[PDB]
Amino acid sequence: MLVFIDDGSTNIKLQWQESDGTIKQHISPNSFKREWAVSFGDKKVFNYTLNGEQYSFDPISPDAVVTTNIAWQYSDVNVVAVHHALLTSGLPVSEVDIVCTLPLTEYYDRNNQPNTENIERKKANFRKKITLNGGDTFTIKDVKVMPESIPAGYEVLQELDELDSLLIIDLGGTTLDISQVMGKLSGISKIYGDSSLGVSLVTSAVKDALSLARTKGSSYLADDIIIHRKDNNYLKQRINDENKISIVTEAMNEALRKLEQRVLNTLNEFSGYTHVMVIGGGAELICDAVKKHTQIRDERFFKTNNSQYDLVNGMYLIGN
Amino acid sequence: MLVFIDDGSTNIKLQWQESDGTIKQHISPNSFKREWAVSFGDKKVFNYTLNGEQYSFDPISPDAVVTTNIAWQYSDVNVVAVHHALLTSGLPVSEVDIVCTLPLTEYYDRNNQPNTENIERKKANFRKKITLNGGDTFTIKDVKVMPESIPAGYEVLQELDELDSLLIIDLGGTTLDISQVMGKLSGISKIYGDSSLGVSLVTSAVKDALSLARTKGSSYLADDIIIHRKDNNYLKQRINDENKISIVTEAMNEALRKLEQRVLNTLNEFSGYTHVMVIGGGAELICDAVKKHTQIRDERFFKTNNSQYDLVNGMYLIGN
Numbered sequence: 280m281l282v283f284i285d286d287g288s289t290n291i292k293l294q295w296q297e298s299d300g301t302i303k304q305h306i307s308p309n310s311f312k313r314e315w316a317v318s319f320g321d322k323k324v325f326n327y328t329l330n331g332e333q334y335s336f337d338p339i340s341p342d343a344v345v346t347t348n349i350a351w352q353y354s355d356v357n358v359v360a361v362h363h364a365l366l367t368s369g370l371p372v373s374e375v376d377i378v379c380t381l382p383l384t385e386y387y388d389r390n391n392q393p394n395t396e397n398i399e400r401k402k403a404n405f406r407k408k409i410t411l412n413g414g415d416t417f418t419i420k421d422v423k424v425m426p427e428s429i430p431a432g433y434e435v436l437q438e439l440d441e442l443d444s445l446l447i448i449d450l451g452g453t454t455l456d457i458s459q460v461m462g463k464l465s466g467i468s469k470i471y472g473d474s475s476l477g478v479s480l481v482t483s484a485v486k487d488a489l490s491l492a493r494t495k496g497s498s499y500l501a502d503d504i505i506i507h508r509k510d511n512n513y514l515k516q517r518i519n520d521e522n523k524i525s526i527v528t529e530a531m532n533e534a535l536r537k538l539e540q541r542v543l544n545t546l547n548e549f550s551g552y553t554h555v556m557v558i559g560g561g562a563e564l565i566c567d568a569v570k571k572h573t574q575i576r577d578e579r580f581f582k583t584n585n586s587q588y589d590l591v592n593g594m595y596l597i598g599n
Numbered sequence: 600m601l602v603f604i605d606d607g608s609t610n611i612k613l614q615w616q617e618s619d620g621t622i623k624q625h626i627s628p629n630s631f632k633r634e635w636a637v638s639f640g641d642k643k644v645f646n647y648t649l650n651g652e653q654y655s656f657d658p659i660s661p662d663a664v665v666t667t668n669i670a671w672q673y674s675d676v677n678v679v680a681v682h683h684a685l686l687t688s689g690l691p692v693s694e695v696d697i698v699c700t701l702p703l704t705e706y707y708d709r710n711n712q713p714n715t716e717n718i719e720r721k722k723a724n725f726r727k728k729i730t731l732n733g734g735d736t737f738t739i740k741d742v743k744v745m746p747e748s749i750p751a752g753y754e755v756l757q758e759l760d761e762l763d764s765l766l767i768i769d770l771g772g773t774t775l776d777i778s779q780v781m782g783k784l785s786g787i788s789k790i791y792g793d794s795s796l797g798v799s800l801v802t803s804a805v806k807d808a809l810s811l812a813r814t815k816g817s818s819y820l821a822d823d824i825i826i827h828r829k830d831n832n833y834l835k836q837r838i839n840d841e842n843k844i845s846i847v848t849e850a851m852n853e854a855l856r857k858l859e860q861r862v863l864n865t866l867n868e869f870s871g872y873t874h875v876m877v878i879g880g881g882a883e884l885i886c887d888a889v890k891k892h893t894q895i896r897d898e899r900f901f902k903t904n905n906s907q908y909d910l911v912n913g914m915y916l917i918g919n
């Protein structure tokens with residue numbers, strides 16, 4: 280079995296196809312604490328041991344450590360999150376081959392050439408042995424590494440003439456990376472990674488406007504508000520009450536406005552692209568501004584409505 | 600301004616393109632009561648007058664009258680729902696040309712030929728004058744009518760050879776229609792409409808499980824549960840607790856299995872199709888079963904992740 284994994288610092292996305300020809304997409308959060316969970320009842324808990332350290336999946340983990348999540352890519356927790364993702368995917372415990380991802384500025388050096396040291400370091404990380412109390416864990420065999428962004432725009436790129444170039448904008452949970460690639464992957468024109476902004480900006484704004492606990496527990500509430508930000512009817516029924524709908528809609532627009540300014544400002548660093556694609560979980564939050572501020576016809580502007588999965592799907596369509 | 604309108608009996612979907620080339624999609628529910636609403640405060644209420652009768656948008660309308668929603672297509676409420684959709688779309692009040700829809704078995708007679716009487720009846724319906732208290736209403740000028748299903752599969756159909764044929768499966772709120780159309784619209788092979796089943800089957804089940812009020816006010820809760828039916832973490836935070844997650848998950852699965860059996864049984868009435876497409880709001884609820892029980896390669900199986908909008912988008916790509 281081969282599993283494609285876009286192990287982001289917010290959510291791990293998985294995609295694979297089963298014998299009955301069904302293609303499955305799974306998503307599992309990166310929310311673990313460095314200690315085992317205690318269950319005196321039947322509630323299932325996942326306690327792991329990796330590199331001698333203890334870890335457990337935590338549904339209410341503090342949104343703390345809003346610092347360097349780049350190092351997370353080579354961390355123990357990353358290994359745990361991926362294994363946990365495999366365990367809750369539905370697939371049967373077994374040996375598996377995987378293809379994981381490395382952010383653009385980690386996969387490539389400043390010369391836009393493969394950073395072999397980082398790629399190997401990523402493969403080595405998944406060799407760290409893991410254990411699960413009261414259960415079996417999958418066995419990761421072969422590890423392949425693909426860079427982010429490019430796999431998502433691969434389909435479109437096969438269609439582009441060598442002279443054309445696709446601009447890929449990826450808004451993630453805590454990062455906003457933009458790259459430009461010549462048609463048929465004739466070369467990488469430019470890469471601009473930014474780990475100072477992400478969707479969490481709006482999520483954090485929402486958690487503030489409603490004064491919600493700064494943990495994973497309230498992440499779903501925040502996301503539902505952002506996702507349905509344009510449907511008052513939904514908000515009316517969702518927001519506790521007191522109709523803070525005014526303040527939250529006010530907080531969201533602030534953050535969204537900031538995401539747009541950043542993207543537009545960075546966009547000014549690129550030129551000559553003939554096609555544009557917006558991917559990542561935050562795609563819907565900036566697609567309008569991007570399309571408005573680019574000179575590209577509808578025919579050449581790409582965006583799906585399953586944006587958080589665009590990358591892992593692209594990886595799949597290539598390596599499966 | 601030209602507006603494409605898929606006025607379904609559950610939700611009115613709109614799609615149009617503005618000056619800055621921005622393409623917008625809007626959704627507005629069909630939840631009205633035959634009586635004005637009384638507001639003693641600042642809360643805005645929409646009270647309409649059509650054909651004399653009084654109507655008003657109702658956020659907590661009873662899910663009553665689950666009888667004939669086909670006649671709804673030519674009703675006064677439909678006219679009100681469309682006008683209400685226009686008013687909450689974000690577009691400026693004005694004159695507008697529109698393209699609306701008619702279910703497959705209404706647009707076509709049993710000989711699969713345009714039912715001109717029904718088509719004209721649909722156009723005439725929007726000529727009924729409407730009024731809004733405390734505001735102006737849009738003015739519907741030219742009315743065009745497209746059948747359901749086919750516009751959604753039009754893109755793919757242009758690519759198919761005249762000999763191939765696309766099977767379009769549309770699962771809506773209260774209807775399940777299936778059609779088979781020859782490549783390049785070289786002819787309609789078969790139409791099978793079924794107004795006995797719809798997504799409301801699962802929504803009703805969910806409401807029963809959580810014993811929620813049988814009104815629109817609880818429809819959002821029900822839909823979030825169904826949409827996130829595979830994410831325990833979300834369900835854990837969404838469900839009012841008590842972990843009825845077992846009972847609701849049990850209710851949903853049974854309703855879903857019923858939807859699947861119906862679709863599979865009807866599918867047995869079709870043959871010779873070379874491509875398959877699933878659309879409508881319920882697409883995600885039956886896509887797997889359908890792909891599993893069809894002999895079609897992945898390349899020839901179509902499904903977007905914005906299913907409720909597939910039709911209106913198809914209408915837009917053809918008429919705009």
Ligand SMILES: Nc1nc2c(ncn2[C@@H]2O[C@H](COP(=O)(O)OP(=O)(O)NP(=O)(O)O)[C@@H](O)[C@H]2O)c(=O)[nH]1
Nearest residue numbers: 287288289290451452453454478506559560561587
């Ligand atoms: N508004 C909105 N948010 C979405 C949508 N899909 C996913 N999200 C959310 O957007 C955030 C970003 O998701 P994603 O890009 O997958 O995160 P990541 O890849 O883990 N981030 P990073 O690349 O920085 O490591 C998540 O909190 C996710 O739940 C959507 O359609 N709309």
Ligand SMILES: Nc1nc2c(ncn2[C@@H]2O[C@H](COP(=O)(O)OP(=O)(O)NP(=O)(O)O)[C@@H](O)[C@H]2O)c(=O)[nH]1
Nearest residue numbers: 607608609610771772773774798826879880881907
């Ligand atoms: N599970 C699920 N439900 C969805 C999704 N998108 C929309 N829905 C819901 O599915 C139901 C059906 O939507 P839709 O097909 O547009 O309704 P309709 O077109 O008005 N129905 P009808 O054709 O019978 O007149 C609605 O209650 C809608 O909210 C989705 O991705 N997943």
Ligand SMILES: [Mg+2]
Nearest residue numbers: 287451452559
């Ligand atoms: Mg990412």
Ligand SMILES: [Mg+2]
Nearest residue numbers: 286287380381
């Ligand atoms: Mg990764």
Ligand SMILES: [Mg+2]
Nearest residue numbers: 607771772879
């Ligand atoms: Mg419909």
Ligand SMILES: [Mg+2]
Nearest residue numbers: 606607700701
């Ligand atoms: Mg209609």
